[PDB]
Write a protein that binds this ligand. Structure first.
Ligand SMILES: *[C@@H]1O[C@H](CO)[C@@H](O[C@@H]2O[C@H](CO)[C@@H](O)[C@H](O)[C@H]2NC(C)=O)[C@H](O)[C@H]1NC(C)=O
Ligand SMILES: *[C@@H]1O[C@H](CO)[C@@H](O[C@@H]2O[C@H](CO)[C@@H](O)[C@H](O)[C@H]2NC(C)=O)[C@H](O)[C@H]1NC(C)=O
Ligand SMILES: *[C@@H]1O[C@H](CO)[C@@H](O[C@@H]2O[C@H](CO)[C@@H](O)[C@H](O)[C@H]2NC(C)=O)[C@H](O)[C@H]1NC(C)=O
Ligand SMILES: *[C@@H]1O[C@H](CO)[C@@H](O[C@@H]2O[C@H](CO)[C@@H](O)[C@H](O)[C@H]2NC(C)=O)[C@H](O)[C@H]1NC(C)=O
Ligand SMILES: *[C@@H]1O[C@H](CO)[C@@H](O[C@@H]2O[C@H](CO)[C@@H](O)[C@H](O)[C@H]2NC(C)=O)[C@H](O)[C@H]1NC(C)=O
Ligand SMILES: *[C@@H]1O[C@H](CO)[C@@H](O[C@@H]2O[C@H](CO)[C@@H](O)[C@H](O)[C@H]2NC(C)=O)[C@H](O)[C@H]1NC(C)=O
Ligand SMILES: *[C@@H]1O[C@H](CO)[C@@H](O[C@@H]2O[C@H](CO)[C@@H](O)[C@H](O)[C@H]2NC(C)=O)[C@H](O)[C@H]1NC(C)=O
Ligand SMILES: *[C@@H]1O[C@H](CO)[C@@H](O[C@@H]2O[C@H](CO)[C@@H](O)[C@H](O)[C@H]2NC(C)=O)[C@H](O)[C@H]1NC(C)=O
Ligand SMILES: *[C@@H]1O[C@H](CO)[C@@H](O[C@@H]2O[C@H](CO)[C@@H](O)[C@H](O)[C@H]2NC(C)=O)[C@H](O)[C@H]1NC(C)=O
Ligand SMILES: *[C@@H]1O[C@H](CO)[C@@H](O[C@@H]2O[C@H](CO)[C@@H](O)[C@H](O)[C@H]2NC(C)=O)[C@H](O)[C@H]1NC(C)=O
Ligand SMILES: *C1O[C@H](CO)[C@@H](O)[C@H](O)[C@H]1NC(C)=O
Ligand SMILES: *[C@@H]1O[C@H](CO)[C@@H](O)[C@H](O)[C@H]1NC(C)=O
Ligand SMILES: *[C@@H]1O[C@H](CO)[C@@H](O)[C@H](O)[C@H]1NC(C)=O
Ligand SMILES: *[C@@H]1O[C@H](CO)[C@@H](O)[C@H](O)[C@H]1NC(C)=O
Ligand SMILES: *[C@@H]1O[C@H](CO)[C@@H](O)[C@H](O)[C@H]1NC(C)=O
Ligand SMILES: *[C@H]1O[C@H](CO)[C@@H](O)[C@H](O)[C@H]1NC(C)=O
Lengths: 86, 420, 203, 50, 50
């Protein structure tokens, strides 16, 4: 690979979502054996564009998603004098 | 000299004077934002000691300094890939543009990818890429997303925003003619759809000219990509200084370890190696600290770039100056060697004219206020016009609403509210 | 591992503290890594040199720890500022910023306390089950171009309706939901339909 | 061994050859006295900033 | 000129008098063998993380 030499994993033509990032677009995943593949960026969706065509939604979904954000870490104090010298 | 801040302009303000634009300009401007820096790994043992066992044994006395430096550098390296993922991997499904490109006259040839091109980039992407310009245990890890793959994300985002507008940002991409998408974006900035539709050819020509001017500016003018080149130069200078610090004796007899080992007994050589070790460890710690600070700065820049991609490309932003100077219409991403370039297409009013304006109109002892426009006068007759474009219309009951009598309002005038 | 971001901060802080503690066991060139033994088996002169080596090593370790804690604190402060902004704009109001308060059209958000962070539950509207329709920018009726006030002109094949842009609610082409702007020659792609006038049947 | 601390009657069970015990991060936390041979948990006496 | 490396042959052309070679960071990157006067080249022995 461009990242280096990979031993113990078999190259495959197929592209999947990245699991373990090796680098340079190549990832590795366990599927009996460990395989190495160029990661799949996503499905190929050619939207049916036309100069007189629109797509109007006819239904909806109420989706609730969680976002986790740190706001503080542990307030720690290290007494320099007694740390260094006891 | 003493610098002049700008031209002294006194606005012709009056309590009954307004200025309404009578024309517009479609302006496309580039904003360059760094998203990642080179992932560098510095093996502490090889850098400080090279291949000497005595130096390694002496360095063992310092504990987990080398491991801490390595973990910090690895954190920076993985953070760069996270930054690239956050900026570019904001699209589900790699959208593709139709073979027949009928976009109402708008020309995205320079922005869309080119198959004959090596990395399937756009023209502007090669412009941006062409503008920019292992020893002693130093390695450069390749980025997880190669240039072709980031270009493919950029192509997917561009195709999605051209075809489906902002719909693909929320859920599944919903096709819509580009003219109607531009009309809805005009509605976003407070301009009616008839302004776009009646001026579709002019607006398409202005957009094409603006894109061509961006092309010319990138091709002819150097140093436009100043931020990315500055990041690259800073990283290269830091690495070069780290290498050069290996040539300093730091108070020892020599800056080369093997000579000290060869021409001294192990007791005094131990002290000299200790001096070399502490000097090189100080240099490495300084390098890691400055790399952490620079990585924090790059992470802030990448967060801003991801926010701009979400709020300018995947949608239309009402935040002033967030997605260009003017009234934001839309944005296009372009892959840069270590960043992203946003082409912001914005609406700029032009060719303004002054008119006599009124807050309300007194008709039949009633105060009429515009529903969505403003009461202007060319000198003799009164009209309702939309605020951001001069489209005068007769005062009617359909475009005005009544609230109370006409004595409370200050500045109210007399005119006739035509009842259809 | 759902709360990976918080556990990452906790692990980083614990690892930094553990490294700082372990640095106490390093000799840093001294004869012993424990200060009491050095004072016990040395005269003040030589013990002074050994203690100086230990002091410089431990002071360097402490300086490194404080510098990395300052950098991590700056990162945590950026995260906390983002969390406060999301509390203000997603929870205390409805945000029009795309992807700021979840993937989709933001409706609302609920905060939840976390041991060292905050979890935002973003309730969003996601369109689904789309259908394709024929479409025109305007409608030429009686030599006048009619544009939708707030909707979209759509066609199922034979009839034209006005529907809101994010939901299929077809409605008859009327003067109430459309407005007139000039003739139908200038606009490109205009079609022909009858714009029903509500007043005429009543009269 | 030498230090400052309280010596609590430890509930730990040393193997016969074992003499003292270090906790996580290499800090002495238990010792067995020679003469009477019982386990003594060493806990540093309280300290803190004021 | 002492060093450790892989002595590949290059085509740098060094001028009659110049013997050693360096780079931007002053690291010996080429050296002509005293006998046969051939330009040669120097690359480091392979290293990297596993
Ligand atoms: C819109 O989608 C919802 C699902 O999110 C549909 O509700 C379901 O409809 C199916 C019939 O196909 C029922 O079997 C389910 O029990 C319904 N679930 C719920 C929660 O109501 C709804 O029918 C759809 N509406 C339209 C007009 O298609
Ligand atoms: C979009 O712009 C590109 C470049 O400006 C056009 O490509 C040029 O087309 C002309 C013919 O009109 C050729 O003579 C040039 O060689 C083409 N390339 C360049 C670099 O100028 C393209 O035709 C435009 N699209 C449309 C639909 O007109
Ligand atoms: C609004 O400004 C545009 C400028 O882009 C005008 O369009 C140009 O008009 C001049 C005449 O003064 C022509 O020579 C150019 O060829 C036009 N350019 C394009 C791209 O069409 C436009 O006329 C102005 N509108 C009004 C009402 O004055
Ligand atoms: C201000 O606007 C009004 C309305 O257009 C002008 O009055 C009309 O001018 C036209 C000239 O083309 C005449 O044919 C109409 O009979 C006028 N009266 C109407 C429409 O009620 C007026 O001339 C404008 N004044 C200035 C100074 O521009
Ligand atoms: C806006 O400013 C003008 C100019 O000062 C005001 O016009 C004055 O009105 C008073 C009382 O009607 C007259 O005595 C002055 O002679 C006027 N001055 C001029 C220069 O015309 C006007 O009242 C202000 N307020 C409005 C228009 O609502
Ligand atoms: C607008 O028109 C009304 C109605 O003609 C004016 O109201 C008159 O004001 C004068 C002075 O106060 C009174 O003497 C009249 O009796 C009023 N008439 C009515 C019917 O109420 C009003 O002054 C006009 N305003 C302007 C600015 O011209
Ligand atoms: C498009 O929609 C129109 C409006 O609903 C359809 O026309 C009506 O279809 C119903 C079928 O239930 C008939 O009962 C009516 O007589 C039709 N005409 C009206 C209401 O004026 C039309 O059939 C639809 N076309 C397609 C292809 O689905
Ligand atoms: C939208 O696209 C369609 C399809 O490309 C265009 O339809 C063409 O119209 C011309 C003249 O009206 C015909 O010569 C072609 O044969 C048509 N093409 C097809 C495939 O039927 C249409 O002109 C475009 N513009 C609109 C509808 O405004
Ligand atoms: C919509 O209706 C108008 C008017 O009925 C059509 O205009 C006709 O255009 C043709 C070709 O230009 C002329 O020969 C006719 O004389 C026009 N009619 C009238 C009454 O003047 C227009 O073509 C229609 N649009 C479509 C797409 O069919
Ligand atoms: C140093 O001595 C060597 C040994 O003779 C010289 O190498 C010879 O060069 C000639 C010139 O063509 C060849 O024909 C011989 O075959 C070479 N010797 C061998 C063993 O291959 C070399 O030229 C000398 N260096 C000088 C003169 O600068
Ligand atoms: C705009 O202001 C100018 C200069 O004060 C004035 O001459 C002109 O009449 C004004 N135009 C209108 C329509 O009020
Ligand atoms: C796909 O896999 C087969 C099986 O090993 C291999 O022979 C071939 O070279 C691969 N690539 C293509 C393009 O078929
Ligand atoms: C009307 O407004 C001012 C008044 O001085 C002047 O610049 C000019 O006459 C007109 N200005 C515009 C906005 O065209
Ligand atoms: C109209 O056209 C699309 C084109 O792919 C097709 O899926 C279907 O017939 C219609 N729309 C949808 C998404 O149902
Ligand atoms: C030796 O240890 C035993 C048991 O702990 C104790 O009884 C004895 O007194 C100790 N020896 C002396 C001299 O005290
Ligand atoms: C949607 O497009 C599909 C595919 O072209 C077509 O079969 C269908 O008739 C279209 N439906 C409408 C209402 O335009």
């Amino acid at each position: 690979t461009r990242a280096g030499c990979l031993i113990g994993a078999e190259h495959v033509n197929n592209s999947y979502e990245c699991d373990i990032p090796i680098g340079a677009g190549i990832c590795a995943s366990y599927q009996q054996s460990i395989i190495a593949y160029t990661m799949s960026l996503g499905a190929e969706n050619s939207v049916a564009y036309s100069n007189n065509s629109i797509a109007i939604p006819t239904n909806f979904t109420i989706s609730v998603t969680t976002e986790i954000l740190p706001v503080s870490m542990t307030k720690t104090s290290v007494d320099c004098t007694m740390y260094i010298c006891g | 000299y003493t610098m002049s801040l700008g031209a002294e302009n006194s606005v012709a303000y009056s309590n009954n004077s307004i200025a309404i634009p009578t024309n517009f300009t479609i302006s496309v401007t580039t904003e360059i934002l760094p998203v990642s820096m080179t992932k560098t790994s510095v093996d502490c043992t090889m850098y400080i000691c090279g291949d000497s066992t005595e130096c390694s044994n002496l360095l063992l006395q310092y504990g987990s300094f080398c491991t801490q430096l390595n973990r910090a550098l690895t954190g920076i390296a993985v953070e760069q890939d996270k930054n690239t993922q956050e900026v570019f991997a904001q699209v589900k499904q790699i959208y593709k543009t139709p073979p027949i490109k009928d976009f109402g006259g708008f020309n995205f040839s320079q922005i869309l990818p080119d198959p004959s091109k090596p990395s399937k980039r756009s023209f502007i992407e090669d412009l941006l890429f062409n503008k920019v310009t292992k020893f002693n245990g130093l390695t450069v890890l390749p980025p997880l997303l190669t240039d072709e793959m980031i270009a493919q994300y950029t192509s997917a985002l561009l195709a999605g925003t051209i075809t489906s507008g902002w719909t693909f940002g929320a859920g599944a991409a919903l096709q819509i003619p580009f003219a109607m998408q531009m009309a809805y974006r005009f509605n976003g900035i407070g301009v009616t759809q008839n302004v776009l539709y009646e001026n579709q050819k002019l607006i398409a020509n202005q957009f094409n000219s603006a894109i061509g001017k961006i092309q010319d500016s990138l091709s002819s003018t150097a140093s436009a990509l100043g931020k990315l080149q500055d990041v690259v130069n800073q990283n290269a200078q830091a690495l070069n200084t780290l290498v050069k610090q290996l040539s300093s004796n730091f108070g020892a007899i020599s800056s080369v370890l093997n000579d000290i080992l060869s021409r001294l007994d192990p007791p005094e050589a131990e002290v000299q190696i200790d001096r070399l070790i502490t000097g090189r460890l100080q240099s490495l710690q300084t390098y890691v600290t400055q790399q952490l600070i620079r990585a924090a700065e790059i992470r802030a820049s990448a967060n801003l770039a991801a926010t701009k991609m979400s709020e300018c490309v995947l949608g239309q932003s009402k935040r002033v100056d967030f997605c260009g100077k003017g009234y934001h219409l839309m944005s296009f991403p372009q892959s840069a060697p270590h960043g992203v370039v946003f082409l912001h297409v914005t609406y700029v009013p032009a060719q303004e004219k002054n008119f006599t304006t009124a807050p309300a109109i007194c008709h039949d002892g009633k105060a009429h206020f515009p529903r969505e426009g403003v009461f202007v006068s060319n000198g003799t007759h009164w009209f309702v016009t939309q605020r951001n474009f001069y489209e005068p219309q007769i005062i009617t009951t359909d475009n005005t609403f009544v609230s109370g009598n006409c004595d409370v309002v200050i500045g109210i005038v007399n005119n006739t509210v035509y009842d259809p | 591992s759902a709360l990976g971001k918080l556990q990452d901060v906790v692990n980083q802080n614990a690892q930094a503290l553990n490294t700082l503690v372990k640095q106490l066991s390093s000799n840093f060139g001294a004869i012993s890594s424990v200060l009491n033994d050095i004072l016990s088996r040395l005269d003040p002169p030589e013990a002074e040199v050994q203690i100086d080596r230990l002091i410089t090593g431990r002071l360097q370790s402490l300086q490194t720890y404080v510098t990395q804690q300052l950098i991590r604190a700056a990162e945590i402060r950026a995260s906390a500022n983002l969390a406060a902004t999301k509390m203000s704009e997603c929870v205390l109001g409805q945000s029009k910023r795309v992807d700021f308060c979840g993937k989709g059209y933001h409706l609302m958000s609920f905060p939840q306390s976390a041991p060292h962070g905050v979890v935002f539950l973003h309730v969003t509207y996601v369109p689904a089950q789309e259908k394709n329709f024929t479409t025109a920018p305007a409608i030429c009726h009686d030599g006048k171009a009619h544009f939708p006030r707030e909707g979209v002109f759509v066609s199922n094949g034979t009839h034209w309706f006005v529907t809101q842009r994010n939901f299929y609610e077809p409605q008859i082409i009327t003067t109430d939901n459309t407005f007139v702007s000039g003739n139908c020659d200038v606009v490109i792609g205009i079609v022909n339909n009858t714009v029903y006038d509500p007043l005429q049947p009543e009269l | 061994l030498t230090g400052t601390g309280v010596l609590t009657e430890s509930n730990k069970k040393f193997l016969p050859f074992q003499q003292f015990g270090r906790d996580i991060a290499d800090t002495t936390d238990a010792v067995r006295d020679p003469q009477t041979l019982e386990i003594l948990d060493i806990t540093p006496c309280s300290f803190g900033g004021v």
